[PDB]
């Protein structure tokens, strides 16, 4: 059974005093819903299942998965979490803008043939940018197998400008990757003493109909720590807090405060909370305030999280040419990125706060893009920008916030 | 259970009435000296409606005046109408997202326009809706109305034409595409091999834009953020089929009447239509909106005669003519298929040919007119003759012994009108 | 007389009964006195001579080239066309009461009749009362999407598609279709192009098409499946016969 306490002063990353979810390693690959039987066979079949509702965004969403590494009657000597969700793009304009997104990279390619998508993984590995590939063509001709481990080494000699050094080739295989991954993952440094910081990528309500009269608890929001630990009963404060734009005017953002009840993992989690994992943090909020995936898109803090709430931002356009790795035989103008059109809606994807806007103007060097939402991320962080090419958004640019409007109730 | 909801938009947010919307919102229009959004209100009176919340962004102050002092706003009226506005409005994926942020519907809630000319009973239609959605789990998603036409009638116009492809036997959409400068249509073949029962393509449906939705459509609308129009909403939802299926079904009607007024042709068909008496029980001389104004007597050949009308001898009013209280006729007159505002006034030997004029327009004796519009307070002087689809707009006086070409649109503000004058036609 | 029965034959006198000799007895259960049937020289230009061991009413056979397709069988056979032509096939099971197929020939006077059964990849597309079918194509000539012309909506605004339909290869034709088969050699098989050539070219004294659709039985497809199928349905279709 777990052995968590509630006294603790620095702990480390591979601490046995957690021992539940230390680094998110990141899995991103061709696998085309394939990974999933990876995942499943490196952690198991249904050991992270808490909280179910009907899905919001099921193609924008990032899926946790966390696993627990033993050797030896086995002592266990890490358990990093697999985070993968489909589509490439999204996870790739996440990660590029800020950090703490999928420490560890992990490839799991095919070893039957080197299509685009291929091609396209190593570029979005490139572009996040430790990796990892692993051959996925199980059941295969040994000749067969010599001559796809060939052609594999010629795609990581290509690939080596940016990362060629990765090493693996039906349980055995997820043993010997799951050692090499233990010997080779490296330990990340991460700051525990910086004040609270939560993204909130899920709401719940676990008020199940016709509850007792005082037996309802309600507000056990789901999301990810971004910096730093935080205890149970502390006084959390939601970023984005309740907007209401019936003022006639600029919407009114009220905060709302809570204590937090409780931190739980996939298992029974402790008072402090472990970076890098989908911590679910149970508090005393309104049901009602947080339905069903309602109140996603927020940030949490303990002390006031220093990013304020803002209306409009501008953003130094920086795009890129074509499509990053995603160019087919024919290319009839499909990786061809438009220039900044005036009145485009497209996302802005600030670490795991992904808010949408429409460029109101821009002269070759600012876009002020007002957010579709009021936000608060930071003042200065790096903003991707995103748009859809059909029915799928994707990395079309980068940028830094310069200025804006923001607005502070109470 | 709960009682019926509907939003309703009352901002056309595409730029069709220009310059006339410069001036009056659209929704605002007379259409039969009756507002168009006292129509919308009255087919959702009458279809059952109970709670109705109106979106208003584009001078809202004139709408809210107009609105509070109608009847649907009295303590005695069924419908609790509720004035929301917010410039920050620019399209109806904006109200969408607004609707479920605010969080008003609680299931099963109406969607139209501010401008919908209808009698529609949707009873049956919400029937069909809320037990699929009972029998599937809440599968489907949104429901359409739809009219069977023919593809020759004026108001099927070229703009608006759209074709379908749907499942006969579930009256499920499948696809669905505007038809607007194309001489072929193409039809996805996917959605053959999925149902191999038989499929059915249909061109004769006429787009009411009545939607019965579930606030699954504020979640899909507040998710999917590029959405900004229905038809983006429904071609998205038909393009990302295997994810998030939420299948989409359709309700055609074949015995009443429902239209949406968009530009001046769909409003000249629906203004023949409804003084014509297509969209029974709605009708001029019936008085809907109980106002004292539009009292009316019915006589032959569709002639609405209000009170004080003062007929003068010799004049004629050959069939489908409505004439507003207070408005004064010449002599030798030739009324047809035309509609006279309230105090009026008209010259001797005057023709008047499928015009419209609203309230406080003045024509002097001798001019022809034909097919025109002539907004409030305009005025015409002698010896002047009016081209088909010629527009007169807010006291744009025309000059005496002028003939305006075919395509005129006038109004006293300079660049979006192709002329600007107030005392003649040449400069 | 106006019609002649014209039997295709490019087959094998399989099952318990010779195969040919289940359409051909359809021809005298209505009339059809005379009736021609064309063989295949690919193999033998000689079944003629097997198949004159049968006892039908009355035969005529007439030999083929090596290679020859149903219209080029036609082309072949035009010079003893007078009237109107009945085109069967030899693999075909069916009890189908033919007088409803030529009353669509027979009450509108349309230049092309035929019979189509539902099935148990081309497309088909009739009008709403399911007689006069005014589209068809098939995937072979389709990329990925279906196009319809507007005219034909204009004209016809609600069109119903069938998918898995199976045809019976039985075509009652007029005597022009023939001789504009005279006019252009670039037409070899009447179901692969001389069908859509016509249902196209309805839309430029016109051309009127009916086909007419069946719940009860298909013919004797090439796969050995179908003649199983075929075997099995036989002695429920001769108990009546």
């Given at each position: ?47 992270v299942r808490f909280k179910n509702e009907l899905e919001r965004n099921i193609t924008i969403k990032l899926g946790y ?20 969700c489909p589509?490439?793009?999204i ?107 939560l993204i909130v990528i899920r709401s719940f309500d676990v008020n ?10 309600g507000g056990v929001a789901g999301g990810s ?13 939601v970023?984005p807090g309740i907007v ?12 709302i ?7 739980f ?13 989908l911590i679910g943090v149970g508090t005393?909020i309104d049901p009602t305030l947080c339905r069903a995936d309602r109140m996603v898109g927020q940030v949490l ?46 996302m802005?994807n600030?670490?795991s706060l992904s808010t949408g ?15 579709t939402n009021?936000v ?35 | ?95 969408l997202r607004?609707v479920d942020a605010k969080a008003?519907v ?32 809440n599968?489907?998603v ?72 579930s606030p699954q459509v504020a979640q899909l609308f507040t998710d999917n953020f ?17 994810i998030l299926?939420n ?181 | ?241």
């Amino acid at each position: 059974l777990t052995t968590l306490d509630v006294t603790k002063l620095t702990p480390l990353s591979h601490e046995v005093i957690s021992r539940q979810a230390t680094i998110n390693i990141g899995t991103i690959g061709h696998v085309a819903h394939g990974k999933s039987t990876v995942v499943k066979a490196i952690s198991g079949v249904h050991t992270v299942r808490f909280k179910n509702e009907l899905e919001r965004n099921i193609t924008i969403k990032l899926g946790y998965a966390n696993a627990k590494i033993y050797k030896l009657n086995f002592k266990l000597v890490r358990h990093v979490s697999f985070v993968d969700c489909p589509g490439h793009d999204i996870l790739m304009a996440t990660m590029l803008n800020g950090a703490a997104v999928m420490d560890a990279a992990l490839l799991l390619i095919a070893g039957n043939e080197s299509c685009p998508q291929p091609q396209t993984s190593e570029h979005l590995a490139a572009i996040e940018i430790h990796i990892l590939i692993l051959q996925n063509k199980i059941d295969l001709v040994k000749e067969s197998q010599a001559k796809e481990q060939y052609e594999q080494i010629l795609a990581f000699v290509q690939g080596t400008v940016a990362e060629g050094a990765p090493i693996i080739p039906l349980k055995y295989n997820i043993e010997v990757v799951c050692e090499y991954i233990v010997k080779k993952i490296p330990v990340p440094p991460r700051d525990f003493t910086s004040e609270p910081r939560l993204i909130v990528i899920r709401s719940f309500d676990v008020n199940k109909p016709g509850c007792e009269v005082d037996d309802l608890k309600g507000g056990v929001a789901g999301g990810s720590i971004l910096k730093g630990v935080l205890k149970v009963g502390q006084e959390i404060e939601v970023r984005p807090g309740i907007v209401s734009k019936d003022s006639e005017g600029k919407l009114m953002c009220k905060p709302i405060f809570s204590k937090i009840v409780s931190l739980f993992a996939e298992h029974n989690d402790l008072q402090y909370a472990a970076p890098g994992g989908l911590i679910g943090v149970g508090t005393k909020i309104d049901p009602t305030l947080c339905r069903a995936d309602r109140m996603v898109g927020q940030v949490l803090g303990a002390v006031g999280a220093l990013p304020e709430i803002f209306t409009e931002l501008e953003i130094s356009y920086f795009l890129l040419r074509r499509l990053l790795g995603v160019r087919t035989e024919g290319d009839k103008k499909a990786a061809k990125v438009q220039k900044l059109s005036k009145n485009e809606v497209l996302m802005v994807n600030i670490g795991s706060l992904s808010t949408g806007g429409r460029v109101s103007a821009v002269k070759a060097d600012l876009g002020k893009i007002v957010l579709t939402n009021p936000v608060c991320t930071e003042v200065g962080e790096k903003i991707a920008l995103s748009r859809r090419v059909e029915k799928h958004w994707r990395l079309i640019g980068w940028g830094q916030i310069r200025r804006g409007v923001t607005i502070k109730p109470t | 259970p709960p009682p019926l909801q509907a939003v309703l938009v009352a901002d056309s947010f595409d730029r069709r009435f220009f310059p006339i919307s410069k001036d009056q919102p659209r929704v605002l229009l007379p259409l039969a000296n009756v507002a168009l959004i006292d129509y919308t209100l009255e087919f959702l009176t009458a279809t059952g409606v109970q709670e109705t919340f109106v979106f208003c962004c584009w001078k809202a102050a004139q709408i809210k005046e107009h609105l509070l002092k109608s009847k649907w706003c009295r303590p005695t009226s069924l419908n609790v109408v509720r004035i929301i506005t917010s410039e920050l409005y620019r399209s109806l994926g904006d109200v969408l997202r607004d609707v479920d942020a605010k969080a008003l519907v609680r299931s099963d809630f109406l969607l139209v326009y501010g401008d919908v000319i209808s009698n529609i009973n949707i009873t049956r239609a919400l029937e069909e809706h809320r037990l699929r959605r009972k029998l599937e789990k809440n599968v489907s998603v949104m429901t359409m109305i739809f009219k069977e036409s023919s593809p020759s009638h004026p108001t099927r116009c070229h703009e608006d034409n759209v074709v379908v492809a749907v499942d006969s036997t579930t009256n499920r959409v499948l696809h669905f595409q505007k038809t607007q400068g194309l001489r072929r249509f193409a039809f996805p073949l996917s959605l053959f091999q999925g149902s191999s029962d038989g499929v059915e393509v249909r061109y004769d449906l006429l787009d009411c834009h009545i939607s019965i939705c579930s606030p699954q459509v504020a979640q899909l609308f507040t998710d999917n953020f590029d959405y900004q129009t229905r038809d983006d909403f429904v071609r998205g939802l038909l393009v990302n089929e295997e994810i998030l299926g939420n299948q989409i079904h359709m309700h055609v009607t074949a015995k009443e009447y429902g239209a949406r007024v968009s530009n001046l042709h769909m409003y000249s068909a629906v203004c023949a239509d409804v003084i014509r008496r297509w969209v029974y029980p709605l009708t001029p001389e019936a008085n809907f909106t109980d106002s004292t104004t539009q009292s009316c007597t019915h006589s032959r050949h569709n002639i609405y005669r209000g009170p004080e009308v003062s007929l003068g001898h010799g004049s004629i009013l050959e069939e489908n003519v409505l004439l507003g209280s207070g408005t004064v006729i010449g002599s030798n007159c030739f009324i047809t298929n035309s509609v006279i505002g309230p105090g009026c006034h008209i010259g001797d030997n005057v023709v008047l040919d499928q015009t419209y004029l609203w309230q406080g327009v003045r024509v002097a004796a001798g001019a022809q007119i034909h097919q025109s519009l002539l907004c409030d307070n305009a005025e015409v002087k002698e010896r002047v003759t009016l081209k088909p689809r010629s527009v007169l707009t807010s006291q744009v006086v025309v000059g005496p012994n002028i003939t305006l070409p075919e395509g005129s649109v006038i109004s006293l503000h300079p660049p979006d009108a192709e002329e600007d004058e107030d005392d003649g036609e040449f400069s | 007389m106006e019609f002649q029965a014209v039997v295709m034959a490019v087959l094998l006198p399989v099952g318990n009964k010779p195969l040919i000799w289940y359409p051909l007895n359809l021809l005298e259960r209505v009339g059809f006195e005379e009736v021609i049937v064309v063989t295949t020289r690919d193999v033998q230009k000689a079944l003629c001579a097997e198949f004159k061991m049968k006892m039908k009413p009355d035969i005529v056979c007439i030999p083929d080239d090596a290679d020859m397709g149903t219209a080029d069988s036609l082309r072949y056979i035009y010079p003893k066309l007078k009237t109107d032509v009945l085109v069967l096939s030899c693999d075909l099971i069916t009890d189908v009461a033919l007088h409803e197929v030529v009353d669509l020939f027979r009450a509108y006077d349309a230049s092309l009749a035929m019979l189509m059964r539902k099935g148990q990849r081309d497309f088909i597309g009739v009008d709403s009362t399911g007689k006069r079918l005014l589209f068809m194509a098939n995937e072979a000539d389709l990329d990925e999407e279906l196009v319809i012309k507007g005219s034909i909506l204009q004209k016809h605004p609600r069109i119903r598609f069938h998918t898995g339909l199976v045809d019976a290869h039985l075509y009652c034709l007029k005597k022009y279709i023939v001789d504009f088969l005279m006019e252009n050699g670039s037409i070899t098989s009447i179901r692969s192009e001389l069908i859509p050539y016509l249902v196209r070219k309805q839309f430029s004294k016109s051309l009127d098409i009916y086909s007419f659709i069946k719940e009860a039985n298909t013919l004797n497809l090439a796969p050995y499946d179908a003649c199983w199928n075929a075997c099995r349905g036989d002695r429920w279709e001769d108990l009546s016969r």
